[PDB]
Amino acid sequence: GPVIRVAGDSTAVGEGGRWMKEMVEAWGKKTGTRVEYIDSPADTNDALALYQQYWAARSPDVDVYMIDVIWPGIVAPHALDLKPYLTEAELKEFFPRIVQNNTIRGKLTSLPFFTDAGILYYRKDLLEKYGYTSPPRTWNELEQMAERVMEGERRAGNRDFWGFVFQGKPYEGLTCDALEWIYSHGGGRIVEPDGTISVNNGRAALALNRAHGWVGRIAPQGVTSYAEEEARNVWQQGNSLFMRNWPYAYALGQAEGSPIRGKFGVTVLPKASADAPNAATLGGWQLMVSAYSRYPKEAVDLVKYLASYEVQKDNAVRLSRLPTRPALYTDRDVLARNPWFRDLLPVFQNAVSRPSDVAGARYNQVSEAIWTEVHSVLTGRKKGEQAVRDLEARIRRILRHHHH
Numbered sequence: 001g002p003v004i005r006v007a008g009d010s011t012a013v014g015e016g017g018r019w020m021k022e023m024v025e026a027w028g029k030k031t032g033t034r035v036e037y038i039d040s041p042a043d044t045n046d047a048l049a050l051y052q053q054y055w056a057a058r059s060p061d062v063d064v065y066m067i068d069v070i071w072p073g074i075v076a077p078h079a080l081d082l083k084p085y086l087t088e089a090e091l092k093e094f095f096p097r098i099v100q101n102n103t104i105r106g107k108l109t110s111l112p113f114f115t116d117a118g119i120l121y122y123r124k125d126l127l128e129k130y131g132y133t134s135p136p137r138t139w140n141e142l143e144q145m146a147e148r149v150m151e152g153e154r155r156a157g158n159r160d161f162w163g164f165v166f167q168g169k170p171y172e173g174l175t176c177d178a179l180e181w182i183y184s185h186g187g188g189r190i191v192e193p194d195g196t197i198s199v200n201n202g203r204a205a206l207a208l209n210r211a212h213g214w215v216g217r218i219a220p221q222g223v224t225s226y227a228e229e230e231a232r233n234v235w236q237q238g239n240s241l242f243m244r245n246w247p248y249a250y251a252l253g254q255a256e257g258s259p260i261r262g263k264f265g266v267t268v269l270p271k272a273s274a275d276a277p278n279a280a281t282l283g284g285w286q287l288m289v290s291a292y293s294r295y296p297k298e299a300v301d302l303v304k305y306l307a308s309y310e311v312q313k314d315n316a317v318r319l320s321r322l323p324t325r326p327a328l329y330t331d332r333d334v335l336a337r338n339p340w341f342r343d344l345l346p347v348f349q350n351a352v353s354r355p356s357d358v359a360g361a362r363y364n365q366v367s368e369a370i371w372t373e374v375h376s377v378l379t380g381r382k383k384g385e386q387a388v389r390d391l392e393a394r395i396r397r398i399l400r401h402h403h404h
């Protein structure tokens with residue numbers, strides 16, 4: 001019978017890829033359908049480029065793709081419209097914001113699978129050791145805490161110890177981190193939902209200068225090459241007071257044999273001042289049936305399974321990844337394992353989006369401009385003031401003649 005082939009989630013990031021292959025195999029066994037899994041690269045922008053090769057070829061060789069929240073406007077031609085396959089009641093079981101994000105010109109490109117928001121990981125043991133009672137609320141507090149704890153831990157003999165790790169590599173994850181820096185300084189959304197390119201302002205420049213200030217001081221010099229896993233590995237070995245990362249890192253830090261099990265919490269990222277907005281970049285992944293699949297009915301069935309209550313539950317409990325079903329945030333077993341899901345729900349619902357709606361199919365070009373100009377501040381090549389001016393110009397060229 002058919003072989004249903006799935007591209008999604010990378011075995012190079014946490015346990016995601018192993019778990020996803022497990023779920024696909026479970027569906028195959030349940031339905032008596034042969035299945036195969038195709039591994040993806042760690043970085044989302046690399047995965048996009050890989051999947052674009054299949055799409056350009058109208059290739060039937062992948063039936064189902066795990067797609068990033070920032071992708072629907074790029075990938076819509078390559079997606080089977082799921083709208084006719086779901087009842088209105090079925091669709092309403094997902095967060096409306098994410099169903100809306102995944103709907104492009106009326107086409108439901110993909111079902112919501114898991115959501116994501118950037119958060120602050122912090123070492124509770126180390127805060128207590130050094131006389132702090134709460135995690136930092138302002139970036140200045142984060143810097144002051146990081147300097148004090150680093151001084152102490154280095155004096156105590158840990159030469160691997162840093163104050164703060166984050167994603168500073170030139171790739172999409174830096175766009176995520178930078179949106180949080182800029183938005184939390186009251187510098188705006190880089191490109192506003194209405195199309196205004198707002199980034200050339202002093203608050204956005206300050207945010208970027210601040211982040212440069214961390215490099216080689218409270219964060220490793222090598223942070224300019226860090227993606228999610230490189231940051232996580234410093235953190236997870238016990239060598240960082242603070243980390244910016246996504247929810248998946250929580251379950252990994254709590255696993256048996258983790259050096260930091262039981263020693264951390266999570267909270268909203270800091271902000272410049274009490275009147276700035278909280279910043280948490282909206283992430284997450286969706287499930288797309290390929291427009292080029294020869295087996296749309298079977299592929300839709302698998303996608304519905306993967307996005308189901310019990311599979312999302314298993315993702316939450318085992319991998320601490322955020323459900324796209326509001327009902328799971330009240331499930332006793334989800335909450336018992338991840339109490340912070342309740343505590344930070346408002347952070348997740350107020351997460352700030354990257355400018356993928358407004359940039360539509362040009363988003364990847366816009367983001368490449370953002371991460372390259374930001375990276376030039378991090379590396380010291382440019383000051384924030386010059387970078388936000390140069391970024392304004394670049395985005396203006398990229399989006400000239402584009403309307404949403």
Ligand SMILES: OC[C@H]1O[C@H](O[C@H]2[C@H](O)[C@@H](O)[C@@H](O)O[C@@H]2CO)[C@H](O)[C@@H](O)[C@@H]1O
Pocket residue numbers: 009010013016041042043044068069070115116172173174176228246247248282283284285321
């Ligand atoms: O790097 C930016 C990318 O980060 C997140 O995707 C991670 C995800 O949290 C992990 O659980 C796993 O699936 O790896 C993904 C990276 O391949 C965001 O969800 C995504 O929106 C964002 O672009």
